Structure 1
Amino acid sequence: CTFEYVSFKNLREFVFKNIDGYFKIYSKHTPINLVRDLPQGFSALEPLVDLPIGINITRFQTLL
């Protein structure tokens, strides 16, 4: 518990990476026409958060 923090027509996109023990998150939100596959076109992802965790990561799970 040595660190803690608090703050279909559409698609939410994200990127997660860990470097130097800093864990970094980026995002984009957009409307979409079709659900079957990712959109055949370009849009950029922008940063949200930088976390000083130092912890090691090799697996993950999504929460429904």
Structure 2
Amino acid sequence: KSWMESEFRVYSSANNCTFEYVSQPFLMDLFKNLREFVFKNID
């Protein structure tokens, strides 16, 4: 009685990785909510 992710097809290959970081594992829940994000690429 709960959705479970089973498909991830985004990149065919991954070679010469230049960074990797994984946060701590958790559970995502599968009236609204607003998620705002600011992405800045500097220096």
TM-score of the two chains, using structure 1 as the length reference: 0.28
More strand as a share of residues: 1
Higher relative contact order (CA 8 A, sep 6+): 2
Point out the structure with max Rg over C-alpha: 2
